[PDB]
Amino acid sequence: GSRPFMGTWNEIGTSQ
Amino acid sequence: VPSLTQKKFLCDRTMWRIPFSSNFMSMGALTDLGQNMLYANSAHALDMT
């Protein structure tokens, strides 16, 4: 939620 | 020369299996049909040929 601009699914999902 | 086809099924180093179970699937180890109310709740002899 403070650097979400990553591979995403519907939630910043690819955040690991 | 006219020919007639044959077919073998060589399959070695394995055992045959017949999971005692409703749909023959390994959804567990204590099968869903070895726990039912007609096998694990009633005596039964069998004979297979």
């Binding site: 995403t8 519907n10 939630e11 999902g13 | 699937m25």
Partner: protein, 43 residues
Amino acid sequence: MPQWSYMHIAGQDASEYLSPGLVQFARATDTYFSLGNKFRNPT
């Protein structure tokens, strides 16, 4: 972007565009019956 919503090209994922029930069925039944490969999860 209504077109890439109801074909699931780039939108919601499987876990939350199903019902509150079908996800339960697909997450409980995954050892014998697999309702996970049908639906599309977009990325």
